[PDB]
Design an enzyme around this catalytic site. Structure first.
Site, PDB file in Angstrom:
ATOM      1  N   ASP A  13       0.607  -1.170  -0.044  1.00  0.00           N
ATOM      2  CA  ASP A  13      -0.148  -0.124  -0.137  1.00  0.00           C
ATOM      3  C   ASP A  13       0.840   1.317  -0.086  1.00  0.00           C
ATOM      4  O   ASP A  13       0.225   2.286   0.496  1.00  0.00           O
ATOM      5  CB  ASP A  13      -0.997  -0.087   1.242  1.00  0.00           C
ATOM      6  N   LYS A  16       1.944   2.200  -5.416  1.00  0.00           N
ATOM      7  CA  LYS A  16       2.147   1.658  -6.647  1.00  0.00           C
ATOM      8  C   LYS A  16       1.090   1.767  -7.700  1.00  0.00           C
ATOM      9  O   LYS A  16       1.578   2.440  -8.775  1.00  0.00           O
ATOM     10  CB  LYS A  16       2.595   0.215  -6.767  1.00  0.00           C
ATOM     11  N   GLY A  40      -4.278  -4.527  -3.856  1.00  0.00           N
ATOM     12  CA  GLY A  40      -5.198  -3.483  -3.862  1.00  0.00           C
ATOM     13  C   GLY A  40      -4.608  -2.273  -4.448  1.00  0.00           C
ATOM     14  O   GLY A  40      -3.802  -1.786  -3.601  1.00  0.00           O
ATOM     15  N   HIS A  41      -4.699  -1.693  -5.617  1.00  0.00           N
ATOM     16  CA  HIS A  41      -4.170  -0.687  -6.359  1.00  0.00           C
ATOM     17  C   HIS A  41      -5.415   0.358  -6.495  1.00  0.00           C
ATOM     18  O   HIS A  41      -6.260  -0.220  -7.366  1.00  0.00           O
ATOM     19  CB  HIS A  41      -3.412  -1.172  -7.416  1.00  0.00           C
ATOM     20  N   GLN A 224       2.479  -6.060  -2.991  1.00  0.00           N
ATOM     21  CA  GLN A 224       2.947  -6.053  -1.731  1.00  0.00           C
ATOM     22  C   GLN A 224       4.246  -5.289  -1.410  1.00  0.00           C
ATOM     23  O   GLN A 224       4.585  -4.189  -2.364  1.00  0.00           O
ATOM     24  CB  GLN A 224       3.208  -7.385  -1.372  1.00  0.00           C
TER      25      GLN A 224
HETATM   26  N1  LIG Z   1      -3.202  11.587  -0.077  1.00  0.00           N
HETATM   27  C1  LIG Z   1      -2.756  10.745  -0.868  1.00  0.00           C
HETATM   28  N2  LIG Z   1      -3.305   9.621  -1.188  1.00  0.00           N
HETATM   29  C2  LIG Z   1      -2.323   9.224  -2.137  1.00  0.00           C
HETATM   30  C3  LIG Z   1      -1.362   9.366  -2.589  1.00  0.00           C
HETATM   31  N3  LIG Z   1      -0.921   8.630  -3.617  1.00  0.00           N
HETATM   32  C4  LIG Z   1      -1.812   7.638  -3.622  1.00  0.00           C
HETATM   33  N4  LIG Z   1      -2.830   7.981  -2.810  1.00  0.00           N
HETATM   34  C5  LIG Z   1      -3.889   7.116  -2.238  1.00  0.00           C
HETATM   35  O1  LIG Z   1      -3.332   6.132  -1.005  1.00  0.00           O
HETATM   36  C6  LIG Z   1      -3.670   4.833  -1.617  1.00  0.00           C
HETATM   37  C7  LIG Z   1      -2.502   3.916  -1.795  1.00  0.00           C
HETATM   38  O2  LIG Z   1      -2.853   2.592  -1.270  1.00  0.00           O
HETATM   39  P1  LIG Z   1      -2.880   1.593  -2.493  1.00  0.00           P
HETATM   40  O3  LIG Z   1      -3.824   2.234  -3.491  1.00  0.00           O
HETATM   41  O4  LIG Z   1      -3.493   0.629  -1.567  1.00  0.00           O
HETATM   42  O5  LIG Z   1      -1.317   1.547  -2.868  1.00  0.00           O
HETATM   43  P2  LIG Z   1      -0.930   0.287  -3.630  1.00  0.00           P
HETATM   44  O6  LIG Z   1      -1.584  -0.899  -2.932  1.00  0.00           O
HETATM   45  O7  LIG Z   1       0.514   0.366  -3.414  1.00  0.00           O
HETATM   46  O8  LIG Z   1      -1.105   0.155  -5.342  1.00  0.00           O
HETATM   47  C8  LIG Z   1      -4.752   4.812  -2.419  1.00  0.00           C
HETATM   48  O9  LIG Z   1      -5.970   5.139  -1.686  1.00  0.00           O
HETATM   49  C9  LIG Z   1      -4.510   6.121  -3.272  1.00  0.00           C
HETATM   50  O10 LIG Z   1      -5.763   6.543  -3.599  1.00  0.00           O
HETATM   51  C10 LIG Z   1      -0.805  10.664  -2.421  1.00  0.00           C
HETATM   52  O11 LIG Z   1       0.369  11.151  -2.685  1.00  0.00           O
HETATM   53  N5  LIG Z   1      -1.524  11.378  -1.279  1.00  0.00           N
HETATM   54  O1  LIG Z   2      -1.023 -14.626   2.133  1.00  0.00           O
HETATM   55  P1  LIG Z   2      -1.244 -13.072   1.731  1.00  0.00           P
HETATM   56  O2  LIG Z   2      -2.634 -13.018   1.468  1.00  0.00           O
HETATM   57  O3  LIG Z   2      -0.439 -12.369   0.695  1.00  0.00           O
HETATM   58  O4  LIG Z   2      -1.189 -12.153   3.315  1.00  0.00           O
HETATM   59  C1  LIG Z   2      -0.007 -12.159   3.780  1.00  0.00           C
HETATM   60  C2  LIG Z   2       0.430 -10.933   4.589  1.00  0.00           C
HETATM   61  O5  LIG Z   2       0.599 -10.114   3.372  1.00  0.00           O
HETATM   62  C3  LIG Z   2      -0.079  -8.902   3.497  1.00  0.00           C
HETATM   63  N1  LIG Z   2      -0.776  -8.418   2.260  1.00  0.00           N
HETATM   64  C4  LIG Z   2      -1.035  -8.877   1.332  1.00  0.00           C
HETATM   65  N2  LIG Z   2      -1.180  -8.095   0.038  1.00  0.00           N
HETATM   66  C5  LIG Z   2      -0.928  -6.704   0.886  1.00  0.00           C
HETATM   67  C6  LIG Z   2      -0.778  -5.658   0.063  1.00  0.00           C
HETATM   68  O6  LIG Z   2      -0.869  -5.565  -1.192  1.00  0.00           O
HETATM   69  P2  LIG Z   2      -0.441  -4.233  -2.049  1.00  0.00           P
HETATM   70  O7  LIG Z   2       0.487  -3.372  -1.176  1.00  0.00           O
HETATM   71  O8  LIG Z   2       0.315  -4.629  -3.208  1.00  0.00           O
HETATM   72  O9  LIG Z   2      -1.663  -3.448  -2.316  1.00  0.00           O
HETATM   73  N3  LIG Z   2      -0.602  -4.736   0.859  1.00  0.00           N
HETATM   74  C7  LIG Z   2      -0.230  -4.978   2.287  1.00  0.00           C
HETATM   75  N4  LIG Z   2      -0.389  -6.043   2.812  1.00  0.00           N
HETATM   76  C8  LIG Z   2      -0.615  -7.045   2.051  1.00  0.00           C
HETATM   77  C9  LIG Z   2      -1.289  -9.420   4.228  1.00  0.00           C
HETATM   78  O10 LIG Z   2      -1.709  -8.115   5.146  1.00  0.00           O
HETATM   79  C10 LIG Z   2      -0.510 -10.143   5.450  1.00  0.00           C
HETATM   80  O11 LIG Z   2       0.218  -9.520   6.306  1.00  0.00           O
HETATM   81 MG   LIG Z   3      -2.884  -1.731  -1.962  1.00  0.00          MG
END
Ligand SMILES: Nc1nc2c(ncn2[C@@H]2O[C@H](COP(=O)(O)OP(=O)(O)O)[C@@H](O)[C@H]2O)c(=O)[nH]1
Ligand SMILES: O=P(O)(O)OC[C@H]1O[C@@H](n2cnc3c(OP(=O)(O)O)ncnc32)[C@H](O)[C@@H]1O
Ligand SMILES: [Mg+2]
Ligand SMILES: Nc1nc2c(ncn2[C@@H]2O[C@H](COP(=O)(O)OP(=O)(O)O)[C@@H](O)[C@H]2O)c(=O)[nH]1
Ligand SMILES: O=P(O)(O)OC[C@H]1O[C@@H](n2cnc3c(OP(=O)(O)O)ncnc32)[C@H](O)[C@@H]1O
Ligand SMILES: [Mg+2]
Lengths: 431, 431
Positions: A13, A16, A40-41, A224
């Site tokens: 998170d 990416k 989750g992106h 991840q």
């Molecule tokens: N406030 C803020 N939100 C951001 C920024 N860049 C991304 N986001 C948001 O923060 C989150 C990133 O978490 P996630 O989407 O799960 O990132 P990922 O899992 O690495 O693809 C999402 O809610 C984006 O909408 C930023 O620079 N500022």
């Molecule tokens: O066997 P699993 O289902 O993979 O879970 C194992 C561990 O890995 C974590 N986890 C799995 N995908 C994650 C993710 O995806 P992105 O960052 O790419 O958006 N971001 C954050 N934490 C993540 C789970 O929280 C748990 O700690």
């Molecule tokens: Mg994510």
């Protein structure tokens, strides 16, 4: 550099999805090389949110071909679900998405297993996303799992599937004392989609070798984060794939010497979903703050995320593990309004020793404590700012301090969820 | 280049041991980054044979520090056995060998499992070396396996071990209807060696990052071969680790951008031990010849090895997968006396299509046939020859032909088992 890798330097998170979407403007291909739909992106373009899990984040750009590399554990059900959702929104997925026949398949029993194990662990439970990531990887490594290419012969597939399922079924009912997973239900759900699935197959390594030899811009999208690496992360509180840059060549088939720039996504503050070490974790007001402002709740499971201060020590392991070329400071806009911010610069180990290196397995993090550096915060708003000038000096210092403390430049600074709410100081493609 | 990687481009046994031993003269470190003691490396110095399995092949050179990288599945029993053997021969192993706390442990049940599974598969049996490689990797990925660092707390270790063993024991007796593995026997055998084991621990990634920043010559030693890669090999007839260059960074912790030269060991003719596709396999006189002259029988299990002609198609997949920088043509001396030699240049697929690319999973190799190029052999002896001049033109052409057919130069040519029976045309360290 031609082949750019984008990955999380912490625990997932970091952001990416947005960055990959952003950077793919100039890319021919975008490749997922590990994980599955546990990822989750969230992509935000002019306010329109798009949540990707299994599909690469370059799927919204028609000029880019999105690839699911062999490293990915692929859930036919998950793929179908996402494809449909993007299609209703005008995204012709099937036209842009290709995928490896080598990808192992995540079928129902895998979730059955994932749930059972999780149960068995009781208190010391990993906190896995509930998709069947773990078992799918186990079945791969054990050489009994099914892959996309197994669908090239449905009768043989029914044969292999009948086997693997009886095997797992035995374990589910007799040991776990859990309900069996109906073989026929699985075979059916699968065969219905098989054709769509098979249609997107391409020989990914070769395609990538060709792209590479042409000069094509390719982006590898990480899932991840570094510290969740099966080998290098806080084992066993990790994901079952190598989230470190080494997974790119293993999960894509592109030779390691062709990685040109490794961009690491850095959240400016830390988060974790799942059990496990987290030295800079906060349990106070500011934690709450960091969580609320950042809207820190998992894009794949909702579950509130643990928050804490950025940790240069953990980030520094990430720097060496991934050969970072630069960072993409994300969510800087979230720190706005704090009186002071701080960076963990060293770990105080339980035997009194002070160290700037991280332990590996979880138990070795047991009682480590963070030794901080406290910088003055900033009250001005940095949200949406797209030029350094718009950032208050306090912010610039925090940024320089991270560079000083890590030795890697912050080539990109993100100040909001929307694609264009970013500062591209150095575009990895030219780098 | 400073960080040189030596790996097998075929199905193991190409001759990594000798070459690694040879090339380490100028190296500070030598690192194993995957596999376990399924590997079998024969070093021959002035006639004295040394067979390594788990210990890196740089162990005979006191100027080099041998490292067992986290990627390696390590059998305490195996390590102890080899250490003792080398020690009686004047090799102070403990003085030269270091190892990762992240290495998963291969304990008895793993072999119990390895045997059971193998049995269960019956006819379509993989043909695994019988060590517990597969299960150890499964336990890693499932996040239930024990690692070296788990020995840092023997009581907790007894706790974890009791658990993992009951779990596996249940499966062995109830499903496989096999004999249980005594928990106490395992805990005991383990605890006896624990201290020795723990003494050799070092933080490998950091050590490698430091070495890297100093300029230290480091050699990464591959185990098994490209086509036995869990992801890219003839799945499921493969080993459970990534034998491709991508395993170096994952199984050593060194960042991928720091690999400088990938040297691929190439046997000049092909061999395989274990079930699986093998287009150029021979079943005739010359096969017999290739086997006898090459003394092709597994250094880790004796089992005669299948032989066939070199396959440029399979070798070419290896070239892209590993970013080969050069080849080390080994066993050229074995072809001496043949009327004609031949290289597989293309595959004739079962639907009539001619292709210069290999399929991935085993079933996809089902009925492929080799399309050859037939070169004139050579009657002169090349054994022990250490200068191209000493090689007959026929041999030089075969060598150039391989280069033409692969696009990678043969920087080293080996003409016998002994260290000094080699031609170093381009030393990867200067390259
Ligand atoms: N406030 C803020 N939100 C951001 C920024 N860049 C991304 N986001 C948001 O923060 C989150 C990133 O978490 P996630 O989407 O799960 O990132 P990922 O899992 O690495 O693809 C999402 O809610 C984006 O909408 C930023 O620079 N500022
Ligand atoms: O066997 P699993 O289902 O993979 O879970 C194992 C561990 O890995 C974590 N986890 C799995 N995908 C994650 C993710 O995806 P992105 O960052 O790419 O958006 N971001 C954050 N934490 C993540 C789970 O929280 C748990 O700690
Ligand atoms: Mg994510
Ligand atoms: N005749 C001959 N034998 C060689 C040559 N190079 C190595 N060997 C021998 O061939 C074998 C290589 O198999 P093995 O040791 O299992 O190679 P590894 O598994 O890749 O380390 C060993 O018997 C070596 O002694 C060579 O150039 N010629
Ligand atoms: O689960 P495993 O025990 O790993 O066996 C699975 C498959 O991999 C093969 N095999 C394992 N190690 C091998 C080796 O080591 P080196 O080349 O490094 O000397 N060389 C050749 N073949 C080798 C076995 O033959 C089997 O086909
Ligand atoms: Mg061998």
């Amino acid at each position: 550099g031609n082949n750019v890798v984008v990955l999380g330097t912490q625990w997932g998170d970091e952001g990416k999805g947005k960055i990959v979407d952003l950077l793919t403007e100039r890319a021919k291909y975008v490749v997922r090389y590990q994980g599955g739909h546990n990822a989750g992106h969230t992509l935000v373009i002019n306010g329109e949110k798009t949540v990707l899990h299994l599909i690469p984040s370059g799927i919204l750009r028609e000029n880019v071909t999105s690839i699911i590399g062999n490293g990915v554990v692929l859930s036919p059900a998950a793929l179908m679900k996402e494809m449909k959702e993007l299609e209703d929104r005008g995204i012709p997925v099937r036209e842009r998405l290709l995928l490896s026949e080598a990808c192992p398949l995540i079928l129902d029993y895998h979730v059955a297993l994932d749930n059972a194990r999780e149960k068995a662990r009781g208190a010391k439970a990993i906190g896995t996303t509930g998709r069947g990531i773990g078992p799918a990887y186990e079945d791969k490594v054990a050489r009994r799992g099914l892959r996309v290419g197994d669908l090239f012969d449905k009768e043989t597939f029914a044969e292999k599937l009948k086997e693997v399922m009886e095997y797992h079924n035995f374990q589910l009912v007799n040991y776990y004392k859990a309900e069996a997973v109906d073989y026929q239900k699985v075979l059916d759900d699968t065969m219905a989609v098989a054709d769509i699935l098979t249609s997107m197959v391409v020989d990914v390594s070769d395609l990538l070798d060709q792209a590479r030899q042409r000069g094509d811009f390719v982006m590898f999208e990480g899932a991840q984060g570094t510290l969740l690496d099966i080998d290098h992360g806080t084992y066993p509180y990790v994901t079952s794939s190598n989230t470190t840059a080494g997974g790119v060549a293993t999960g894509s088939g592109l030779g390691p010497r062709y990685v040109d720039y490794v961009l690491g996504i850095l959240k400016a503050y830390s988060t974790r979903v799942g059990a496990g070490p987290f030295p800079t974790e906060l349990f106070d007001e500011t934690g709450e703050f960091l969580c609320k402002q950042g809207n820190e709740f998992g894009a794949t499971t909702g579950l509130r995320r643990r928050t804490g201060w950025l940790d240069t020590v953990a980030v520094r392991r990430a720097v060496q593990l991934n050969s970072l070329s630069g960072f993409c400071l994300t969510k800087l806009d979230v720190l706005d309004g704090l009186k002071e911010v701080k960076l963990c610069v060293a770990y105080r180990m339980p035997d009194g020793r002070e160290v700037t290196t991280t332990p590996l397995a979880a138990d070795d993090w047991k009682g480590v404590e963070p030794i901080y550096e406290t910088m003055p915060g900033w009250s001005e708003s940095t949200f949406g700012v797209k030029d350094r000038s718009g950032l208050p000096q306090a912010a610039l210092n925090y940024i320089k301090r991270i560079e000083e403390l890590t030795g890697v430049p912050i080539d990109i600074i993100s100040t909001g969820p929307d694609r264009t709410e970013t500062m591209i100081l150095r575009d990895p493609f030219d780098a």
